[PDB]
Design a binder for this molecule. Structure first.
Ligand code: HEM
Ligand code: HEM
Lengths: 145, 145
């Protein structure tokens, strides 16, 4: 359950999330677009869910893609900000899950963002320890899907 | 159209938006809920759009309402952060407008948030000058609806 998943965010996991976000969250536009373009490159099958965006290969030059990419980073910002209060983290995660459920995004589908996150993290000198930390946060959302 | 509305965001207006946000945005849960509950109190009819939230009379105590309220504040955070780049502000405003258009929320209906905003600002001692600045930000989003 989402409540059990949130409890998996231990002290050190929370710390690693904050430490890496401090760097990653510094460039929301750049890292956000990198996240999306990597998702579409490594998992081309997900492009169908983003028909509204148009030609996704344009990257940064695609206004709709840039809009979604920047907005995506503020969702991550939101999650990180709620790490101190599990009750708040959960209600925000559930809200966030509602819109993805409406788009029929499964927990398995949602989990594909883990690849992109791991790569962007590694490009900034953050290794497996951090990728695993972020995977735990993603799992919280997966539990609500 | 959206670009044209963003043009009213002059140097002075952006300055007041940033200064007032520094305070208002420092308690996203508290002020976010204040905005929502005030909207519902002053315009009871807007509750019709939030049936999914359940018993909104519970306010802060309502997990779903609290979830929407906190998240709402991150949309504003997004906008404030994009003020110095019209291109980015526009793509993020248009993305934001997509979900509200799907909900059949007209520009006039969206404008009802001006009252709550003015009242929340007043509670932190930000007068009409600041309320006017925020009305202009709301006008940019209204231009997309
Ligand atoms: C770290 C993981 C993810 C985060 C934090 C995230 C965040 C967001 C946010 C905040 C929005 C914009 C608000 C909204 O329209 O609901 C959004 C839109 C969307 N997301 Fe996710 N998302 C994630 C992963 C994914 C994945 C992996 C898929 C699909 C395989 C997905 C599919 C969608 C779709 C289709 C939209 C609508 C885009 C549009 O038409 O504007 N998301 N996501
Ligand atoms: C400053 C003004 C406003 C801001 C920044 C704002 C922000 C947001 C955000 C961030 C979301 C979550 C993402 C999404 O589902 O689209 C949202 C959801 C929503 N907003 Fe707005 N909004 C504003 C005003 C309004 C107004 C005035 C109405 C109605 C008259 C409205 C109706 C909705 C509805 C119905 C939802 C869905 C709530 C749910 O069931 O989860 N919004 N809004």
């Amino acid at each position: 359950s989402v409540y059990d998943a949130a409890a998996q965010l231990t002290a050190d996991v929370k710390k690693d999330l904050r430490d890496s976000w401090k760097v990653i969250g510094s460039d929301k536009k750049g890292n956000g677009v990198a996240l999306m373009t990597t998702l579409f490159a490594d998992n081309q099958e997900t492009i169908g869910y983003f028909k509204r965006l148009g030609d996704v290969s344009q990257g940064m030059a695609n206004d709709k893609l840039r809009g979604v990419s920047i907005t995506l980073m503020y969702a991550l910002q939101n999650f990180i900000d709620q790490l101190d209060n599990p009750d708040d983290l959960v209600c925000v995660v559930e809200k966030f899950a509602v819109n993805h459920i409406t788009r029929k995004i499964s927990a398995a589908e949602f989990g594909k963002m883990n690849g992109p996150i791991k790569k962007v993290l590694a490009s900034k000198n953050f290794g497996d320890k951090y990728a695993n930390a972020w995977a735990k946060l993603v799992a919280v959302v997966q539990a609500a899907l």
